[PDB]
Amino acid sequence: KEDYRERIVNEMFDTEKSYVNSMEICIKGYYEPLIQSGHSVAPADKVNAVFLHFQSVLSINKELLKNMTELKEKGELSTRLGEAFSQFIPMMNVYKLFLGNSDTSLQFLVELEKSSKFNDILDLLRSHLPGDNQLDLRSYLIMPVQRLPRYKLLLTDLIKHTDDDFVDKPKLIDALDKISKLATLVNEVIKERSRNQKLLELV
Amino acid sequence: KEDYRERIVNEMFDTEKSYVNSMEICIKGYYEPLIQSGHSVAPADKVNAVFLHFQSVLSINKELLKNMTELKEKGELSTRLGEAFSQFIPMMNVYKLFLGNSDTSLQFLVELEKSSKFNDILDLLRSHLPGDNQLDLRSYLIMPVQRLPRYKLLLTDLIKHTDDDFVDKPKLIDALDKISKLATLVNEVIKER
Predict the structure, then answer these.
(1) Count of domains in chain B?
(2) b vs e for B70-87, b when ≥16 Cβ sit within 10 Å of the residue's Cβ?
(3) How many beta-carbon pairs below 8 A join chains A and B?
(4) CB A5 within 8 A of CB A158
(5) Which of A133, B63, B76, B85 has CA 20 to 30 A from B19's CA?
(6) What residues of chain B lie within 8 A of the CB of A3, using their CB?
(7) Given B1, B10, B14, which is nearest A200 (Cβ)?
């Protein structure tokens, strides 16, 4: 049914805007302050290894949102959404690199986070984030990791509800095919879990 | 490990405020306009069967947030959160009633939603829902149904990370025990036809 379909389309759009907006707030709010200042317990190399490949994800997602926004204001998003994805999907390797750095990124965060002074700086930077949703760093760094499975979810349900008479349908299928290829998120979730909880018992 | 714990505490608090705030926006923004406007295509009985037991959930959750907020400003939420739950968990039966009505609520929504005029009213009301995330109706009506599992999640993780020297620990255990009882009822429903 058309109106169920519309909902999914709107959810994807609304969670994308949300996602890109959050990402810009982590760059503007955390990354940039660290690279400008608070230098002592937060060396640039440590900070950069933490954020490596994040602007890269923001970049391609911001372009995806742009095209999605272009279509929506023209009242043609339901019918050409897979057009927006066709520019996006082949830029995905960025997601591979980001995912690929998550183990390292987290190892450096946890090392930094031994410093009490460092923690205070981070808590300070957070208190300057806009909105009521002032999330901690991890809660931003994880978002690219979380996006992919949501795409899978969203696109699966949208395809199931898209007739073959939609010209856009193959474009959605291509997208789900390539997005699904990044099912290694589970490996990433697992390894992030272990590192975060390694030192319940001892180290 | 203490700082992992702090996170969960803060997530619960932040998702509660979010939750109660969303709920007030559904009452103020959808329910109240429908009941005042008295549209032919949205009669009170239909509307009320749809929203039945929702204000009741808002009420007890708003009191939970109150107490959580009281504790936070006093810098003592980490350590007395299960105190806040102590007033809440026994008021849960309203969650039973709300859950219990979901089949009916949704049946009436889907019947209403045959009317093109009805859908336009709803889309109009939404346009006036505040903020970027002006959600549709079902996205509000489902939130109580989603809350319970998150409590279970969050409390399970918080207990696991709370040593026995915390005086509040039994209070968290009580809560998980009773919330678990209601989370048994949480299942899925069909996109038939």
Answers:
(1) 1
(2) ebbeeeebbebbbbbbbe
(3) 28
(4) yes
(5) B76
(6) 113, 119
(7) B1
